[PDB]
Amino acid sequence: GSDKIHHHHHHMNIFEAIENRHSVRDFLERKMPERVKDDIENLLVKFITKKLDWKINLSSFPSYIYAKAEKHFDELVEYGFQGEQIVLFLTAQGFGTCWMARSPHPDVPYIIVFGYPRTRNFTRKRRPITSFLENDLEELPPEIVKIVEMTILAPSALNRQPWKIKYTGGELCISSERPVDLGIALSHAYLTAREIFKREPVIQKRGEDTYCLILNP
């Protein structure tokens, strides 16, 4: 056959990926080559402690990604943190995603199913930003308002949005009893802060259920 070497595609930045990421259960089948497996494998992923062993199944409809994780707090934050990086990458490639607590393997916390959306439109229900924030919204400089807004758009199991967020000047801290959801939200804060400050944020565990991002290290 014949074809252009590359047709151009709009590169969506991190803000657009977060804003265009929606949970989709109803998909098409139009395409899912090994090329998209290749694309995922080449994705540079940030990790806190250890990089997980991500697996991609495209011999099932829907297609889904997953990895084995231990049922311990830090490893599940890792799963959420790395997993949402992949979700956002897939979003930017134009794929619908949904975090599924399904798994045919009994040591996998969630799968991430993906594919082309049947539908374009969606709805986004989130509690008010002030319900998440320990600070008065007015105590936040404009960069931080943006990071918090992008963090709140993160998905969470059953949309429970289990985050408490605190800005201290140097750091943005997210606490949650739900380690996977914590990791997911932390990925949004990390990726947007990286874009905003044009530096690599440092992620540090604080106490039992909090991770802080040193924003402009």
Residues of 158-169 as b/e, b for ≥16 C-beta within 10 angstroms?
eeebbbebebee
Give the 3-state secondary structure of the chain.
CCCCCCCCCCCCCHHHHHHHCCECCCECCCCCCHHHHHHHHHCCCCCCCCCCCCEEECCCCCEEEECCCCCCHHHHHHHHHHHHHHHHHHHHCCCEEEEECCCCCCCCCCEEEEECECCCCCCCCCCCHHHHECCCHHHCCHHHHHHHHHHHCCCCHHHCCCCEEEECCCEEEEECCCHHHHHHHHHHHHHHHHHHHCCCCEEEEECCCEEEEECCC
209 near 173, Cβ under 8 Å? no
Among candidates 111, 113, 109, 112, which has minimal Cα distance to 73? Answer: 109
Query: Between vectors from CA 145 to CA 144 and to CA 149, what angle results, nearest 5°?
Result: 115
- Return the domain boundaries, the chain: 1-121, 122-217
Experimental technique of record:
X-ray
Q: What is the distance between the alpha carbons of residues 184 and 87, in angstroms, rounded to a whole number?
A: 10
Q: For residue 165, give both structure tokens.
A: 């967020």
Which class would CATH give 1-121?
alpha beta
Task: Please state, as a whole number, how many other Cβ atoms lie within 10 Å of the Cβ of residue 48.
Answer: 18
Q: Tokens 């944020």 identify what position?
A: 201
Which CATH code, of 3.40.50.720, 3.40.640.10, 3.40.50.620, 3.40.109.30, is assigned to 122-217? 3.40.109.30
Task: Please state, as a whole number, how many other Cβ atoms lie within 10 Å of the Cβ of residue 182.
Answer: 25
Resolution in angstroms comes to: 2.0
> In CATH terms, are 1-121 and 122-217 the same topology?
yes
Residues of 115-139 as b/e, b for ≥16 C-beta within 10 angstroms?
bebeeeeeeeeeeeeeebbeeeeee
**Cβ within 8 Å of residue 35, ≥6 positions away:** none
